[PDB]
Amino acid sequence: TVSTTPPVSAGVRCDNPGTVHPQRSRDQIATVWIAPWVDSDNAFHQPGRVSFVVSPADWVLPARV
């Protein structure tokens, strides 16, 4: 079945958990440092830190005051 992303926000002029301008959430970034290594053509590699996104973003209905 289709996903249902937002739990009802914290509970002119209608107080609806729905019908609120939706924003998208933030992706999660994780950094891995690679140990210096060598390769078949005998080159020594010092990469640094590689950052990758573990989780894609998801929709969110803002809490309404």
Partner: protein, 217 residues
């Protein structure tokens, strides 16, 4: 000295001088001119050129209108006034670009570097790849700087790489700064701080994933 770049709209009219004694050239970057139309008996000779180009020679002595049609359904008009002198080159350009090509990253990374990355990502997600299976965490896999205390948590191993996660505990009660290079032990391939936090304070409990080499040689 440099082509006269002219960005006129579709169906646009641009009045430009041409030479009545020497050949002139009109070219569109990224487009190939298909046809050229002018009043009969004005442009004596017209020749296609490598890519999209029209070399035309006009013996006329009167201003005239010339239409150029490219290969992507673009039609531009030009009002040409012949004049004695050098042949003139014109770079015809579109006004507002119709589409935006998203160029994919052509760059590809080294195989070993990818292998380290995928495993780290999978461990973080918690999904464990098919080859990998659970075993015992290594008792001492990392250097402990400044009074840190490490408690084995989890590990999985596979044919060519193995992974261990340890929970760091800080007993220092001081503001410490993390550098993944400190946690190096002869034989480590990579260290990942799950929470990307530069400084740990007292009781800074970041969990770090280290992939060493199973079957180390």
């Amino acid at each position: 000295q440099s082509p006269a770049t002219i960005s006129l709209p579709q169906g646009g009219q641009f009045r430009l001088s041409i030479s009545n004694t020497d050949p002139n050239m009109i070219f569109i970057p990224g487009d190939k001119v298909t046809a050229i139309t002018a009043p009969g008996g004005m442009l004596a000779d017209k020749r296609l050129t490598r890519a999209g180009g029209v070399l035309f020679t006009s013996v006329a002595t009167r201003t005239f209108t010339i239409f150029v049609e490219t290969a992507r359904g673009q039609t531009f008009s030009v009002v040409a006034t012949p004049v004695k002198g050098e042949g003139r080159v014109y770079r015809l350009m579109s006004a507002e670009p119709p589409s935006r090509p998203e160029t994919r990253k052509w760059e590809t990374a080294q195989a070993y570097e990818k292998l380290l990355i995928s495993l780290n990502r999978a461990v973080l997600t918690g999904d464990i790849p098919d080859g990998y299976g659970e075993v015992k965490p290594l008792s001492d896999g990392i250097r402990l700087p400044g009074g840190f205390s490490v408690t084995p948590l989890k590990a999985w191993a596979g044919d060519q790489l193995r992974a261990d996660r340890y929970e760091l505990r800080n007993a220092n009660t001081w503001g410490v700064a993390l550098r993944e290079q400190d946690f190096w032990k002869p034989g480590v391939r990579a260290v990942m701080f799950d929470n990307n936090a530069q400084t740990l304070m007292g009781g800074g409990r970041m969990t770090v994933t280290v992939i060493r080499g199973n079957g180390e040689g």
